[PDB]
Amino acid sequence: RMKQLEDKVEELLSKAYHLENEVARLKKLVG
Amino acid sequence: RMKQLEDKVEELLSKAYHLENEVARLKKLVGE
Amino acid sequence: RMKQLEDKVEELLSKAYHLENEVARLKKLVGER
Ligand SMILES: [Cl-]
Ligand SMILES: [Cl-]
Ligand SMILES: [Cl-]
Ligand SMILES: [Cl-]
Ligand SMILES: [Cl-]
Ligand SMILES: [Cl-]
Ligand SMILES: [Cl-]
Ligand SMILES: [Cl-]
Ligand SMILES: [K+]
Ligand SMILES: [K+]
Numbered sequence: 816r817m818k819q820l821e822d823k824v825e826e827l828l829s830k831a832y833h834l835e836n837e838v839a840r841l842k843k844l845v846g
Numbered sequence: 847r848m849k850q851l852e853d854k855v856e857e858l859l860s861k862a863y864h865l866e867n868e869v870a871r872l873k874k875l876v877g878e
Numbered sequence: 879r880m881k882q883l884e885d886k887v888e889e890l891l892s893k894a895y896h897l898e899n900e901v902a903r904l905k906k907l908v909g910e911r
Contacts, residue, residue, distance in 0.1 A: 817908055820868060824901045827861055828894040834854055835887050841847055845880060848879065855886040862893040869900050876907050 905911075 816868075816872065817905065817910060820865070820872065821901055821905065823861075823865060824894070824897045827858065827865065828898055830858055831887070831891050831894045834851065834858065835891060837854075838851055838883060838887050841851060842880065842884075845848075848883070852883055852886075855883060855890060858890050859886065859893070862890060862897065865897055866893070869897065869904065872904055873900075873907075876904065
């Protein structure tokens, strides 16, 4: 349970960073 | 594009909430 | 719409960092690896 938990948390963070930059790129098109 | 990103944020918030529940379960278990 | 999207992304990122910190604490408590 511990390894799968660590792995899913790291994936969540990297997905969240990806999303934050995609939203920043979108903000360049709309405001 | 705007609805794709809104859907994604809700998907990841849901995952975050369930991971938080799993953390709290594991903390109680190792605490005993 | 855009500001509500941004607010959720920043909520998400704060939760993911809190999760990362919590997992590091738990990993030390468990002691594995
Ligand atoms: Cl995921
Ligand atoms: Cl993703
Ligand atoms: Cl997950
Ligand atoms: Cl939560
Ligand atoms: Cl759950
Ligand atoms: Cl809009
Ligand atoms: Cl911010
Ligand atoms: Cl903690
Ligand atoms: K995304
Ligand atoms: K919502």
